[PDB]
Ligand binder design. Structure first.
Ligand SMILES: [Cl-]
Length: 253
């Protein structure tokens, strides 16, 4: 059966694995600047459905994604690991941990939304996301991304940072990207605050000093929050030395 495309790097045999999950439009290169600091651990850089080398892999919902995740982990023979997810990757990570994974130590989430709290909020999100879908599904990505990185969550960016990101993300497939966006929209995602608060596994949170929206969301979660200095929503991209120190504080204790 099919499994997610991933890049594996081996570390010491007695340490767990660091399973890294990128955000929307990203690929398995997202966490590599950070991940490579943890030379003694094994690392698995995963490509989510519709991204990188997993572009052709199609999913309907989160269930399908977490089934691909369970199967990928089994193929790589990962029995002991941590799930590290950024934003979209952060949400598939929380979703996967709550459904249940064999040999999970803990989940580290960076700017991952734990879910909307009412049917009205979900209705707004579904409307706004369906707009984005058609935009990715038709229009040139190079133009769609220019608007994508102007959303309130990316406010803290300067135009120089924004130019680079639009250039990096434009190298993608809009149809597969749109199908993923649809399948895992925050509108369809349950409110996992209860399941996380149940404290079924170790759970940590990171977000940038400048990520006002997710700093706020963290206050609602039963988890430690590491606040990355001089960084925004994608804090590992702006301050990797900061994010390494935070992950090290957690993993090496
Ligand atoms: Cl990003």
């Amino acid at each position: 059966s099919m499994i997610l495309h991933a890049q594996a790097k081996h570390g010491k045999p007695g340490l767990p694995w660091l399973v890294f999950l990128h955000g929307f439009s990203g690929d398995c290169h997202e966490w590599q600047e950070v991940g490579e600091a943890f030379a003694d651990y094994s690392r698995l850089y995963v490509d989510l459905p519709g991204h990188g080398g997993s572009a052709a892999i199609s999913v309907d919902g989160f269930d399908d994604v977490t089934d691909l995740l369970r199967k990928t982990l089994v193929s790589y023979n990962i029995l002991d690991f941590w799930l590290v997810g950024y934003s979209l990757g952060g949400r598939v990570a929380m979703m996967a941990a709550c459904q249940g994974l064999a040999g999970l130590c803990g989940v580290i989430v960076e700017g991952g939304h734990p879910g909307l709290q009412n049917a009205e909020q979900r209705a707004e999100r579904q409307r706004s996301d369906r707009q984005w879908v058609q935009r990715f599904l038709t229009e040139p990505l190079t133009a769609v991304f220019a608007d994508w990185y102007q959303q309130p969550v990316f406010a803290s960016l300067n135009d120089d940072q924004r130019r680079e990101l639009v250039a990096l993300r434009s190298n993608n497939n809009g149809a597969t990207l749109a199908a993923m966006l649809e399948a895992t929209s925050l509108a369809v995602q349950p409110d996992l605050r209860a399941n996380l608060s149940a404290r079924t596994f170790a759970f940590y949170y990171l977000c940038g000093e400048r990520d006002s929206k997710f700093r706020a969301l963290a206050a609602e979660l039963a988890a430690d929050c590491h606040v990355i200095p001089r960084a925004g929503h994608n804090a590992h991209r702006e301050n990797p030395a900061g994010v390494i120190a935070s992950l090290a504080q957690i993993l090496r204790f």
